[PDB]
Amino acid sequence: PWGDELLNICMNAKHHKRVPSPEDKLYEECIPWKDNACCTLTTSWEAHLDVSPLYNFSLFHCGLLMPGCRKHFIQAICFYECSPNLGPWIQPVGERVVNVPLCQEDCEEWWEDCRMSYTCKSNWRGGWDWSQGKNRCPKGAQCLPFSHYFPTPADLCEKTWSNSFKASPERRNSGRCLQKWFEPAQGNPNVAVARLFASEF
Amino acid sequence: RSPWCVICDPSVVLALKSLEKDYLPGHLDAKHHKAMMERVENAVKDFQELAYMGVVDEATLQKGSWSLLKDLKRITDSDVKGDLFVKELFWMLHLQKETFATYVARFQKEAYCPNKCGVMLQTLIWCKNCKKEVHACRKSYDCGERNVEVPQMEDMILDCELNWHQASEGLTDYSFYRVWGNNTETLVSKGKEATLTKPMVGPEDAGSYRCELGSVNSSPATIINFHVTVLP
Ligand SMILES: *[C@@H]1O[C@H](CO)[C@@H](O)[C@H](O)[C@H]1NC(C)=O
Ligand SMILES: *[C@@H]1O[C@H](CO)[C@@H](O)[C@H](O)[C@H]1NC(C)=O
Ligand SMILES: [Cl-]
């Protein structure tokens, strides 16, 4: 009826805590989730690594990203790894997450801050040259601005992480979309969203 | 497809504008100026010589720029004209780019993120857009334990300094904590001093200590743990 089954839980993926609980200490961008996290300190740290061991997926493939752009991606990782408010979007493929609605501001700022940075592909979900252990751009793939390969914010949100996220037309504080980062001072705006979606309505 | 990082130096771009407006009139047929410059601008807008990350430190950039400027001035001071001038100039740009590639490859292998543990913030310049911003070099969460034995009644010095600290940006204070067996801590000093001195030590000063070098950011730049033995 209200999906409490689906509230305050962690997905069964390889890095996740089996159940959420508070953390004394999380690294940088993952701190907003301290209160109650699906990530350990180690996980939160690993989210900030160049070629983070979590996915062995390189952000530098077209060269080092502008720091502003790197920040967005890392936050996305913290969110996926640490959020306890994802139940409604969990699916088995041992579980993943599908079409989590990221508020338009989240996708817009991300897109905006990565405009100057460079990539070679528009579907990062596959088709890379994988020979070094880490992905590199395949034969003939040109490095160009993000705004070329992801013409809209929506493209960026949805395609980088294989439809884990959905770019919502809904804006923030609507009750109906999640933030991939939030200021810890202001308290977690995703809890109510989670509750809403767990419900029949 | 990337610019030659050297145009991120204003003196370089101004030197090239001066070449166009001041040098070409007296040294090359007027009917060639336009095309010559288009060709130079293209030389600088693409740098094919280079696993290149597209970044450079101010030092490397400067070295490159100084070098290019020395050679360019060599040519303009020689007062050379016409086909000769054209050939020398483009040879020189070419040579310079190759030289610079060397400087970059060295920088990547020696000066980029030289920290071996912890987190160093270092300013870099992004070649594609000349934008100068600070990059976080993340090596390890830790910097690892120090085992330290101090003769009773000599002074205990705990050194938190690493080589790279002085060069890193966005660092704040060295914090030293005692780590008690009951899982609590006490902050014993917090300051710009990289070492902790505790004089004329007794058995009561043995045990665990931790250094945190603080960051303008949310997390510390260096964590070092010390285990102190007092030798009677
Ligand atoms: C990342 O690389 C390591 C080391 O080569 C490999 O063993 C591991 O399976 C990779 N991690 C993931 C999560 O795929
Ligand atoms: C923990 O142990 C230390 C050292 O024995 C003692 O001074 C301190 O009062 C203890 N702290 C607490 C909170 O019990
Ligand atoms: Cl959340």
Side-chain angles (χ1 to χ4, degrees):
Chain A
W2 319 101
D4 303 41
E5 329 121 13
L6 281 183
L7 289 192
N8 204 96
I9 62 169
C10 304
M11 70 185 78
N12 301 357
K14 66 177 138 201
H15 309 303
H16 288 71
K17 291 209 282 168
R18 285 176 225 98
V19 128
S21 62
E23 290 287 338
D24 278 19
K25 191 160 185 176
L26 293 178
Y27 191 66
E28 300 276 5
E29 299 304 336
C30 295
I31 286 159
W33 293 274
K34 257 191 161 76
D35 324 338
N36 179 46
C38 288
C39 55
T40 57
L41 174 76
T42 312
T43 298
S44 68
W45 156 260
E46 292 184 336
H48 302 62
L49 294 183
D50 274 3
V51 163
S52 203
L54 303 179
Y55 318 114
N56 296 327
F57 183 78
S58 180
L59 297 178
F60 358 119
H61 61 259
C62 269
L64 223 68
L65 300 162
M66 300 296 309
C69 189
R70 171 140 89 122
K71 182 176 194 122
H72 279 283
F73 280 98
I74 282 170
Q75 285 181 335
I77 295 164
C78 284
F79 178 47
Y80 184 91
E81 293 283 347
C82 300
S83 174
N85 300 138
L86 302 192
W89 296 267
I90 292 184
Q91 290 213 315
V93 198
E95 309 182 313
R96 72 160 281 181
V97 122
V98 183
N99 294 327
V100 186
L102 290 189
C103 300
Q104 187 171 77
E105 291 96 324
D106 294 68
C107 293
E108 275 176 0
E109 288 186 22
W110 187 349
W111 187 81
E112 184 59 34
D113 297 344
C114 286
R115 277 220 310 279
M116 312 286 80
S117 318
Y118 275 64
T119 189
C120 56
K121 286 169 56 51
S122 53
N123 286 120
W124 289 17
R125 69 196 182 82
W128 291 91
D129 193 328
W130 266 103
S131 54
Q132 306 312 313
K134 316 301 166 20
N135 57 315
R136 299 178 299 170
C137 299
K139 292 186 179 182
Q142 295 219 301
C143 289
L144 307 173
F146 270 51
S147 53
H148 172 76
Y149 287 102
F150 306 101
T152 64
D155 301 305
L156 185 48
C157 275
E158 296 176 342
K159 294 164 181 196
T160 49
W161 269 78
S162 204
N163 312 285
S164 294
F165 312 123
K166 243 295 143 164
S168 180
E170 300 279 14
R171 312 219 84 223
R172 257 168 187 188
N173 305 305
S174 69
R176 300 225 288 184
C177 59
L178 292 87
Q179 289 177 217
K180 66 159 184 52
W181 200 80
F182 54 89
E183 207 80 55
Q186 318 323 137
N188 192 326
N190 303 342
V191 167
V193 201
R195 287 175 192 167
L196 171 75
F197 281 70
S199 297
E200 293 178 347
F201 327 102
Chain B
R1 180 179 166 72
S2 65
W4 188 10
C5 224
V6 173
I7 35 163
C8 301
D9 178 277
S11 326
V12 164
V13 358
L14 301 174
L16 298 166
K17 188 180 170 168
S18 169
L19 185 75
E20 186 172 26
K21 315 323 276 276
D22 311 336
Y23 198 77
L24 299 196
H27 304 83
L28 182 70
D29 294 341
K31 68 170 201 155
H32 289 300
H33 292 188
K34 292 148 179 176
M36 175 74 185
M37 289 295 311
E38 287 162 21
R39 198 192 157 187
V40 177
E41 291 163 21
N42 281 353
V44 184
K45 287 181 219 144
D46 197 20
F47 172 75
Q48 305 219 246
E49 279 67 7
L50 314 170
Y52 158 66
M53 307 280 75
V55 288
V56 180
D57 59 17
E58 179 59 44
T60 303
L61 174 60
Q62 268 318 115
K63 200 183 191 148
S65 338
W66 282 324
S67 169
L68 163 55
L69 286 162
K70 204 107 71 70
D71 256 340
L72 183 51
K73 198 169 173 278
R74 201 161 227 260
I75 292 171
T76 55
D77 292 350
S78 80
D79 210 30
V80 65
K81 313 191 212 289
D83 269 38
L84 275 150
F85 156 53
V86 184
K87 288 171 195 193
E88 272 165 39
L89 161 68
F90 285 92
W91 175 242
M92 179 270 291
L93 290 179
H94 179 63
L95 221 43
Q96 273 300 153
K97 295 214 217 179
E98 280 168 37
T99 304
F100 190 72
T102 307
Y103 301 159
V104 172
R106 189 177 160 193
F107 152 91
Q108 309 206 174
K109 167 169 177 182
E110 301 179 18
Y112 170 74
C113 299
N115 60 317
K116 290 164 180 164
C117 70
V119 177
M120 177 177 187
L121 307 176
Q122 112 186 74
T123 288
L124 307 170
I125 297 136
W126 269 253
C127 294
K128 212 146 281 178
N129 57 30
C130 295
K131 189 37 172 130
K132 195 206 278 267
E133 262 149 63
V134 184
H135 170 79
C137 294
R138 294 185 224 278
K139 288 270 189 310
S140 65
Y141 186 54
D142 257 16
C143 291
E145 298 171 0
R146 306 303 188 257
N147 181 67
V148 183
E149 309 153 45
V150 181
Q152 211 153 119
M153 316 297 174
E154 297 193 357
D155 299 352
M156 178 195 73
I157 316 291
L158 303 181
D159 194 356
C160 198
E161 183 174 38
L162 302 172
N163 287 342
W164 58 263
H165 286 174
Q166 200 206 352
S168 182
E169 277 146 34
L171 308 204
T172 69
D173 276 355
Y174 289 99
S175 289
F176 285 102
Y177 295 92
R178 290 201 70 175
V179 179
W180 308 115
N182 60 29
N183 188 34
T184 58
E185 311 170 2
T186 315
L187 181 66
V188 307
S189 70
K190 182 167 195 318
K192 289 296 186 287
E193 304 297 336
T195 76
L196 179 59
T197 302
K198 179 78 89 65
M200 291 193 250
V201 78
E204 67 283 7
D205 304 303
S208 289
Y209 296 70
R210 190 175 73 260
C211 174
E212 281 177 35
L213 178 50
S215 183
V216 298
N217 285 157
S218 202
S219 307
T222 280
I223 296 155
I224 297 167
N225 281 84
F226 303 82
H227 298 296
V228 177
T229 306
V230 186
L231 296 180

